[PDB]
Design a protein around this ligand. Structure first.
Ligand SMILES: [Cu+2]
Ligand SMILES: [Cu+2]
Ligand SMILES: [Cu+2]
Ligand SMILES: [Cu+2]
Length: 446
């Protein structure tokens, strides 16, 4: 039943209305598909999990309780917080324990998210539900007067596999240790959804929260859309694009325009495929990285007089220079034998320091990849800029602040990063199955 069900909109935990929130990671049931209540994991009882929303400079406070069978912890993905609140895998809290998160937001507006991060089990916990979105606001962005209220939409894209009953299926074959691809696409935990829209501008806040699938998103119905932000918030100026690549854990802030749409018409969000991301052979039962897949439909149901007008200066981004760095280092992304995914040919030791870095310095990290697969590389505790790629695929998201960057097979991506927060952090591929099977490491800011 294509585009039968209405898109679910997450409740907001807005830190202008909430001083301290409560999350409790617990077993739940929802009918994601086939009217089958399937076992899921939630933070406050249902899916989608709530969108946190906070101004820069406000105090974030959240009491997290773990009612789950095994230890876990929440990582606030893209946030610049003290290591003790970052949700390092070594800080997982046991069943029936409490962690009190407290930090002062101190970073520019942008589109972030949050998920649990237990060592070896992150792919599973996110697959069964423990993720949501986090939005930081600031005065710059507010003064832009971008489409807001009913015209800003969170979109969490996750591909899934369901059985005949309607229950969820995670890993099935050995090839799935290389990444779980799915044949059903959910947005905001809704299978094949539809959104009733007006024929004006909509700001879409897009997170790829899948296990593995890299999406090449296009809208069949409109001619253009506008890239205005990445992981780290607004670009300097909009970029007109016809399609857009987004890997796991990456975030995009686009503007779409329905002004030429007649009532009764539709625009369909879909992925055009990206066969180049994967040179292994995926589980045959499920479509591969090149698959064309419909994702959701926006139904144009009402005419609108809204004239908002997207500014041409969005923000300023000081473009860091290669000479500003005082050290270069190389991270190799390979598969070593036994099918263990690694960085620098080492499996993750939770207790070992793989890179030691001076607090307040600027470094060039060169990320070199092997032939087998594209990898989304993420670092905690930092935002970085993309100095350069060697492959030729056009990545307009390079033009913005980033925390996760897609590294193509045999590509070298060379990023530049200033370390502002001390402590032990992790860097890793964010393909969840690879991270779970050891593609992870620690760096120490000192
Ligand atoms: Cu993450
Ligand atoms: Cu992270
Ligand atoms: Cu990977
Ligand atoms: Cu992480």
């Amino acid at each position: 039943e294509p585009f039968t069900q209405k898109l679910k909109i997450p409740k907001e935990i807005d830190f202008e209305h909430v001083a301290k929130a409560k999350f409790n990671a617990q077993k739940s049931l929802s009918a994601l598909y086939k009217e089958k209540k399937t076992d899921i994991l939630t933070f406050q009882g249902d899916l989608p999990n709530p969108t946190i929303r906070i101004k820069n400079g406000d105090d974030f406070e959240l009491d997290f309780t773990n009612s789950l069978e095994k230890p876990t912890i929440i990582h606030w993905h893209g946030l610049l917080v003290p290591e003790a609140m970052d949700g390092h895998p070594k800080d997982a809290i046991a069943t029936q324990m409490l962690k009190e998160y407290r930090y002062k937001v101190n970073q520019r507006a942008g589109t972030f998210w949050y998920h649990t991060h237990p060592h070896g089990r992150t792919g599973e916990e996110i697959y069964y539900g423990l993720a949501g979105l986090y939005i930081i606001e600031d005065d710059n962005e507010k003064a832009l007067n971008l489409p807001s209220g009913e015209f800003e939409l969170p979109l969490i894209i996750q591909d899934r596999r369901f059985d005949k009953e309607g229950d969820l299926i995670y890993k099935e074959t050995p090839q799935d240790n290389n990444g779980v691809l799915g044949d059903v696409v959910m947005v905001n935990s809704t299978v094949h959804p539809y959104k009733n829209v007006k024929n004006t501008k909509y700001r879409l806040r897009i997170l790829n929260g899948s296990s593995a699938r890299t999406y090449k998103l296009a809208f069949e119905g409109i001619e253009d859309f506008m890239l205005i932000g990445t992981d780290g918030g607004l670009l300097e100026e909009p970029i007109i694009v016809k399609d857009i690549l987004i890997a796991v854990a990456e975030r995009i802030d686009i503007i779409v325009d329905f002004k030429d749409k007649k009532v009764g018409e539709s625009v369909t969000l879909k992925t055009l495929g990206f066969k180049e991301a994967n040179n292994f052979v995926t589980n045959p039962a499920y479509p591969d990285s090149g698959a064309k897949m419909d994702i959701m439909r926006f139904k144009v149901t009402e005419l609108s007089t809204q004239n908002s007008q997207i500014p041409k200066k969005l923000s300023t981004i000081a473009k860091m220079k290669a000479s500003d760095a005082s050290k270069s280092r190389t991270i190799t992304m390979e598969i070593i034998e036994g099918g263990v995914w690694t960085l620098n040919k080492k499996p993750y030791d939770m207790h070992r320091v793989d890179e030691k870095v001076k607090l307040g310095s600027t470094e060039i990290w060169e990320i070199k990849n092997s032939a087998h697969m594209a990898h989304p590389f993420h670092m905690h505790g930092v935002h970085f800029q993309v100095l350069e790629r060697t492959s030729s695929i056009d990545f307009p998201t390079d033009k913005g602040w980033k925390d996760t960057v897609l590294v193509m097979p045999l590509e070298s991506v060379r990023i530049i990063v200033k370390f502002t927060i001390p402590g032990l952090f992790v860097h890793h591929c964010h393909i969840l199955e690879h991270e779970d099977h050891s593609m992870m490491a620690n760096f120490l800011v000192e």
